Amino acid sequence: DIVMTQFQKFMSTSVGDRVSITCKASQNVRTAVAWYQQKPGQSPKAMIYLASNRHRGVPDRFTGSGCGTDFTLTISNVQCEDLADYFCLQHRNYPLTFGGGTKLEIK
Amino acid sequence: EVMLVESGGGVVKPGGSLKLSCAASGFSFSTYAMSWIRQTPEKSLEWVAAISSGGTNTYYPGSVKGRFTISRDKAMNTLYLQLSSLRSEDTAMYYCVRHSGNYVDSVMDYWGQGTSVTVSS
Amino acid sequence: EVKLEESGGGLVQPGGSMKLSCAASGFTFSDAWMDWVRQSPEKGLEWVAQIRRKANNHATYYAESVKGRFTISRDDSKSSVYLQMNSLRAEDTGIYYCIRGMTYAMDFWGQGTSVTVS
Amino acid sequence: QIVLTQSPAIMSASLGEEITLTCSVSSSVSDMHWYQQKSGTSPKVFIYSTSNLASGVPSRFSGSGSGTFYSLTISSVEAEDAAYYYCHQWSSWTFGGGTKLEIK
Amino acid sequence: TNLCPFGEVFNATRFASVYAWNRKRISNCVADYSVLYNSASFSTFKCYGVSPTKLNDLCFTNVYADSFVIRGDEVRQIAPGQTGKIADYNYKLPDDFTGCVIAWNSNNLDSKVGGNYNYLYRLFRKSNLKPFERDISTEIYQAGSTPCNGVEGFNCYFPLQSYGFQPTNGVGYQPYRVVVLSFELLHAPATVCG
Ligand SMILES: *[C@@H]1O[C@H](CO)[C@@H](O[C@@H]2O[C@H](CO)[C@@H](O)[C@H](O)[C@H]2NC(C)=O)[C@H](O)[C@H]1NC(C)=O
């Protein structure tokens, strides 16, 4: 199956900086990657669909781009609202596998 | 200085007719689109009428269309919004509102003081 | 207002069966492709099953780890989808989320339901 | 039909702390204006086209946003900035909900 | 003195959608742009490189008029250099433009009580539109690795969404009929003078 490698489990950035979370893949999933934000105690709300588009009600800070194997989700002006986990999954072939997760905590 | 004063507000039982006025003074009148904005007593604003600069295109929302009528007089430099078939949710305070351009797409620069229209009894 | 709520929160001995139900309302239930995803504390997020919309013959796609122990069935008249689990194991522990449509717009998620084995 | 939702209904900040007021839109709009209504006066205008300031507004208020999420940011909240804040766009027929701000 | 036909591209009974706009070649005319500029019914009359009062004192070779229907909030994206859902994927103007964009409200005609689902627009594309190029290709874009054979359930999404046009929408979500006059001057005898 297609596995998403997400090697950063802990990212430590202060308020008002720019963070770039990467989501490596093992085979060439074309553009079919979605990004999920899971606040502690809730269900994951959708941030990015099809690796470049942006959902409804999500701010302009959340942008993700890239194709091929190595994707990225870059946030700018990191507020205190963004202390959560960030998952990525591929949906090219039907064994859909999520990523590991990248937890952010404020310095 | 730009001044927008209203009048005409009072008490009327349901089914009545009432005409609000808004005397505008302090700017070139017929080159700015104007509008009326009511404030229901839960303090929730909403458009109720909007007229462009030439007095040609008037836009009303779906709840008050066909019973509210806006007017625009360049001669005596006022602005009218007359009411008809008042329901029990038309209790508000009606603000006189001037936009910044010759259409209703721009931002509402200067607001009037507003005189309330309360429907009861 | 779109909402999705789940049921079946309990513990079973390995060898029982538990039928989760996801009642949805607030949208057209005919054209929606609803999956079931799993969150376990040891293995992270996983993906369990998927039922499709009416015009795709009500297709079912399971992960290869839950073949023959997991069936999913929907009913658009009652506007709910069911995930019937039989012959459970030790690694089927976790929280099961019911979603509206994954990897596009209208990507709403449920709230989940804790399923544990003893 | 555009709905304009502001979260939450009432905020509260301390003297000198920064605060961010949010106005999420249902579908995509171009820009967003922000109004301020005090207690017992008419509303005025502060921000038009999401990044500009009106004449006479103190220069701690800043705006950002495009698409379906818009933000009003105050740098150092002092005692005067305690009023409601409505977000309205040309395509709605109703204003925003209005987020009150009160000094802690 | 035979005046030029503007009375079938402006006050027509039904326009076309923005993803397939109507391109009408106008030539061998004596046009009257001053009747258009002083009609006081249009809400947006922006010329982008010519003066609107000096429109009559110009001899062109072809004038091209592009008619489509968009939302009121999206008439800003018919500018040279602007971006959005309409300028990138539906109708792109170049940043050396010489023409005048005309628009007016059309809520009385392009809106029905149940909803007019005749006006479509393109939601995504492979790349941005190079200027003055239409793309009418109703293909389901094939996301994913399995050929889905003409469905819409999972990926294989449809690229065209319909405009939701009701008479109670808002002055920025009411249908605004837009016509874009574009002046072209080739190496040829000038015949469109006025
Ligand atoms: C499209 O049709 C309308 C309806 O006739 C035209 O409006 C007329 O314009 C002429 C020119 O000034 C006036 O003399 C008439 O009185 C108008 N008719 C009315 C107000 O009912 C409109 O001009 C036409 N569009 C174009 C581009 O010619």
Numbering used by the authors:
A (entry chain B): 1 to 107
B (entry chain H): 1 to 121
C (entry chain A): 1 to 118
D (entry chain L): 1 to 104
E (entry chain G): 333 to 526
List sentences quoted exactly from the publication behind this structure.
The substantial and rapid development of mutations on the receptor-binding domain (RBD) of the viral spike protein has resulted in the diminished efficacy of currently available vaccines and immune therapies, as most were developed against the wild-type (WT) or early emergent variants. In this study, we generated two SARS-CoV-2 nAbs with potent and synergetic binding and neutralization efficiencies against various SARS-CoV-2 variants including early Omicron sublineages. Cryo-electron microscopy (cryo-EM) structures of the mono- and double-antibody-bound immune complexes reveal an antibody-binding-induced rearrangement of the RBD. However, here again, we show that, despite with theoretical collision, Class I and Class IV nAbs could simultaneously bind to the RBD and confer not only synergetic neutralization but also rearrangement of the bound RBD.
The neutralizing activities of two mAbs were evaluated using vesicular stomatitis virus (VSV)-based prototype SARS-CoV-2 pseudovirus (VSV-SARS-CoV-2) and lentivirus (LV)-based prototype SARS-CoV-2 (LV-SARS-CoV-2) and SARS-CoV (LV-SARS-CoV) pseudoviruses, as well as the authentic SARS-CoV-2 virus. Both mAbs exhibited potent neutralization efficacies against the prototyped SARS-CoV-2 with median inhibitory concentrations (IC50) of 34–160 ng/mL, with 3E2 further conferring cross-neutralizing activity against SARS-CoV (IC50: 49 ng/mL). We noted in the SPR analysis that the combinations of two nAbs could simultaneously bind to the spike protein, which suggested that the two nAbs recognized diverse epitopes through noncompetitive binding to the RBD. The double-antibody cocktail indeed displayed a significant synergistic effect against D614G strain with IC50 of 9 ng/mL, an improvement of ~4- to 18-fold as compared with that of the single antibody. As for 3E2, it mainly binds to an epitope on the opposite side of the 1C4 epitope; a similar binding mode is shown for nAbs S2X35, S2X259, VacW-209, COVA1-16, and CR3022. The binding epitope comprises a total of 13 residues (A372, S375, G404, D405, R408, N437, Q498, T500, N501, G502, V503, G504, Y505, and Y508), of which D405, R408, Y505, and Y508 form seven hydrogen bonds mainly with the light chain of 3E2. Cryo-electron microscopy reveals the two nAbs synergistic neutralizing virus through a rigorous pairing permitted by rearrangement of the 472–489 loop in the receptor-binding domain to avoid steric clashing. Indeed, the structural comparison suggests that the RBD would undergo dramatic local rearrangement mainly in the aa. 472–489 loop, with a root mean square deviation (RMSD) value of 3.13 Å, and that this change would be accompanied by an outward extension of ~18° compared with the apo-RBD. Additionally, D405N and R408S that emerged in BA.2 and thereafter variants resulted in abolishing the activity of 3E2.
